[PDB]
Scaffold this active site. Structure first.
Site, mmCIF file in Angstrom:
data_model
loop_
_atom_site.group_PDB
_atom_site.id
_atom_site.type_symbol
_atom_site.label_atom_id
_atom_site.label_comp_id
_atom_site.label_asym_id
_atom_site.label_seq_id
_atom_site.Cartn_x
_atom_site.Cartn_y
_atom_site.Cartn_z
ATOM 1 N N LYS B 112 0.818 -1.213 0.000
ATOM 2 C CA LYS B 112 0.000 0.000 0.000
ATOM 3 C C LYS B 112 0.851 1.262 0.000
ATOM 4 O O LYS B 112 0.443 2.285 -0.567
ATOM 5 C CB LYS B 112 -0.915 0.007 1.219
ATOM 6 C CG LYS B 112 -1.788 -1.210 1.301
ATOM 7 C CD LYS B 112 -3.110 -0.988 0.691
ATOM 8 C CE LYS B 112 -4.128 -1.563 1.605
ATOM 9 N NZ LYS B 112 -5.359 -1.991 0.928
ATOM 10 N N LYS B 194 -3.931 -9.314 -6.558
ATOM 11 C CA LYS B 194 -5.249 -9.790 -6.162
ATOM 12 C C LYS B 194 -6.324 -8.777 -6.553
ATOM 13 O O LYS B 194 -6.047 -7.593 -6.774
ATOM 14 C CB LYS B 194 -5.315 -10.075 -4.651
ATOM 15 C CG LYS B 194 -5.424 -8.836 -3.736
ATOM 16 C CD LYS B 194 -5.685 -9.247 -2.282
ATOM 17 C CE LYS B 194 -6.035 -8.038 -1.409
ATOM 18 N NZ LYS B 194 -7.372 -7.442 -1.750
ATOM 19 N N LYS B 197 -11.155 -4.143 -3.789
ATOM 20 C CA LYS B 197 -12.245 -3.167 -3.953
ATOM 21 C C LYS B 197 -11.741 -1.783 -4.289
ATOM 22 O O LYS B 197 -12.457 -0.998 -4.923
ATOM 23 C CB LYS B 197 -13.080 -3.012 -2.683
ATOM 24 C CG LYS B 197 -14.034 -4.078 -2.430
ATOM 25 C CD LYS B 197 -14.613 -3.862 -1.047
ATOM 26 C CE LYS B 197 -13.605 -4.147 0.001
ATOM 27 N NZ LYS B 197 -13.894 -3.490 1.289
#
Ligand SMILES: Nc1ncnc2c1ncn2[C@@H]1O[C@H](COP(=O)(O)OP(=O)(O)OP(=O)(O)O)[C@@H](O)[C@H]1O
Ligand SMILES: Nc1ncnc2c1ncn2[C@@H]1O[C@H](COP(=O)(O)OP(=O)(O)OP(=O)(O)O)[C@@H](O)[C@H]1O
Ligand SMILES: C[C@H]1c2c[nH]c3cccc(c23)S[C@H]1C(=O)O
Ligand SMILES: C[C@H]1c2c[nH]c3cccc(c23)S[C@H]1C(=O)O
Ligand SMILES: [Mg+2]
Ligand SMILES: [Mg+2]
Lengths: 330, 334
Positions: B112, B194, B197
């Site tokens: 992230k 992956k 959302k």
């Protein structure tokens, strides 16, 4: 009336450095400001505490506030962990604090060196919870000693950063650092500040130190090897003597009037000891009364947490509303 | 007395078939044999910058989609994280028992940080500690998550053990539950990352509310390899896109990878894609029929959050009380 907020950790017995750097100003500000003073036990556990000693030290710190003149009818006094909003704002403010802002902090690096086996996330996150403590109360002014200047700078930056995104949620707080006594140094190592947590108790004068201990600790304080010996101010070269002057000077407020005591280091040390102990005995009389009135200590914590909760909840609702959280159903 | 299950999801966008197969399907299925507690973790969500109006909407979107999927407020405790102050309170406390080094070694923080290099904030770094607080508050035994959270759950186990070693048996030591298929559904146009959302590229994900036509289009365009003739065989290293389609199909139907490889002998990737799209859309029919009724019942949504936060608070405050006693805090006067 502007708002004052400040904290101290129940990590040990409050020292004369805590008194001169912070507590003396806390007492002085109680009429001109709406003052809020906190025993920050959530900050204290960023360093490993014996559980029994931590509970005792929390109550010792509260009784010492009271003994120094913090007035529960003028100021809010409370224990940090008694107000959940502090942890709740602490988390939300994490999300607006840069990792780099925390890794650059002097305290984090210094305490990491001192506690190399317990470099934990609380130690890293320390300034964020501090900002949360302050910003919850719409604080204007934060009386601290010099070592907290950098932390307070972050609180200012966080308040302004959050306000820029969401509007005037927070007041932007400012430090109040005294011009004398803002960094009292350790007696046996005058290059490092006096810290209540020091394992070497002889570096430190606790507010509860009996007169014999004070003489003994001051007599052994490191001083320079000048020939002849004179009381002069040179922090780079007479650190111990300069710290001893700073202590006596910020205890009697004169400065060079003591520099004009041109005697030996043992005369200074005997005077500092007598002067320091005269202060403590008055403080100590009130302490031994407050500390042993458990009903009074419990009432002060109860009333203080209720007062703080009212203000803290107001700011936190506003923060949660601004961020976009769904309000808690009533 | 049933074992206790806790799990959360962030209100960060429409839940995907990755969220369903990795976590939500198990959440629903554990409701009869476990005492289940499910959370919309809005405090975690803000570790990535959210527009405030979207976050509020996404919190209720996520809640309505939990309910549409079969999370049953008669059987499970359902609540929004920020409504229960004990989460942030224990979150701070567990910070003091988590090593800085452990947090800097998390793959999520690293990944992230790469995606949000302009907002590497302390919340993102401290993410796994709040996660451990959410879990440990409820004396949780089992935590159904996808594979990407395996490392984070190992930290939760380590924090609970570390704390108990100092203070006695305050916490249950939680265990992950990660499914054998569909634990890490991969992005359709970039099968080496992956499904997420939060992906800006919506064509990488299938949201749980997507139409059959939308599913067909996104599966049709899913990246595959250049094998000629096409080979339908599971090989993540060499055939990431085909392998992801097989995993998705296996996760929907229950068919093993060897069974599916036998099924697709002599067939093309178009055969595989058509079967995946039909299976995925069939998986979604029931929850899609109910979503808008749940989403447009504001009184129901509010009541669920009200009851859930009350139920959560009762359990969380008992654990936090024990934590504060053990640590040495002066208890708040009554
Ligand atoms: N040597 C010092 N001289 C002056 N002020 C000080 C000194 N040490 C701490 N202070 C001030 O006292 C207040 C309370 O700080 P804190 O509770 O951390 O005390 P401490 O002595 O530094 O303890 P610890 O070693 O556990 O950090 C703060 O405003 C801090 O700046
Ligand atoms: N691709 C995936 N396959 C399987 N499980 C997944 C996948 N992505 C997330 N999960 C699981 O879904 C649950 C909720 O995770 P979360 O709310 O972070 O979703 P997300 O899609 O990863 O979103 P974000 O990108 O905002 O992190 C967790 O148990 C997580 O392990
Ligand atoms: C006691 C600590 C602390 C916690 N919250 C606050 C708020 C204001 C000032 C301080 C603090 S001073 C700081 C220190 O470490 O000196
Ligand atoms: C949504 C996040 C989260 C917060 N609290 C919990 C508790 C259990 C599982 C998870 C979480 S899964 C995790 C993730 O990022 O996947
Ligand atoms: Mg300190
Ligand atoms: Mg995720």
């Amino acid at each position: 009336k502007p708002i004052v907020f400040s904290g101290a950790q129940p990590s040990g017995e409050l020292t004369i450095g805590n008194y001169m750097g912070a507590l003396r100003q806390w007492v002085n500000m109680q009429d001109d400001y709406h003052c809020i003073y906190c025993i920050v036990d959530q900050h204290a556990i960023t360093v490993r505490q014996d559980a029994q000693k931590l509970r005792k030290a929390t109550l010792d710190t509260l009784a010492l506030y009271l003994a120094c003149g913090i007035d529960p009818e003028k100021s809010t006094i409370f224990v940090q962990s008694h107000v959940p909003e502090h942890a709740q704002l602490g988390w939300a403010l994490n999300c607006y604090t840069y990792f780099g802002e925390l890794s650059r902090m002097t305290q984090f690096k210094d305490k990491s060196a001192r506690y190399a086996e317990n470099i934990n996330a609380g130690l890293f996150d320390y300034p964020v919870l501090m900002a949360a403590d302050i910003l919850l109360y719409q604080t204007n002014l934060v009386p601290v000693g010099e070592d907290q200047k950098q932390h307070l700078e972050l609180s200012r930056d966080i308040a302004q950063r959050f306000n820029a995104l969401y509007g005037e949620i927070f007041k932007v707080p400012e430090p109040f650092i005294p011009k004398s006594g803002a960094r009292v140094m350790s007696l046996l190592e005058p290059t490092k500040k006096m810290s209540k947590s020091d394992d070497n108790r002889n570096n430190v004068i606790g507010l509860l130190e009996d007169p014999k201990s004070v003489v003994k600790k001051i007599k052994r304080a490191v001083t320079d090897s000048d020939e002849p010996p004179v009381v002069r101010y040179d922090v780079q070269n007479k650190a111990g003597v300069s710290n001893l002057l700073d202590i006596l000077s910020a205890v009697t407020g004169q400065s060079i009037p003591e520099l004009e005591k041109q005697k030996m280091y043992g005369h200074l040390k005997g005077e500092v000891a007598d002067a320091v102990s005269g202060m403590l005995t008055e403080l100590q009389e009130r302490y031994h009364r407050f500390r042993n009135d458990e009903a009074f200590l419990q009432q002060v914590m109860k009333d203080g947490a209720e007062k703080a909760s009212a203000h803290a909840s107001r700011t936190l609702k506003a923060v949660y509303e601004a961020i976009g959280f769904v309000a808690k159903p009533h």
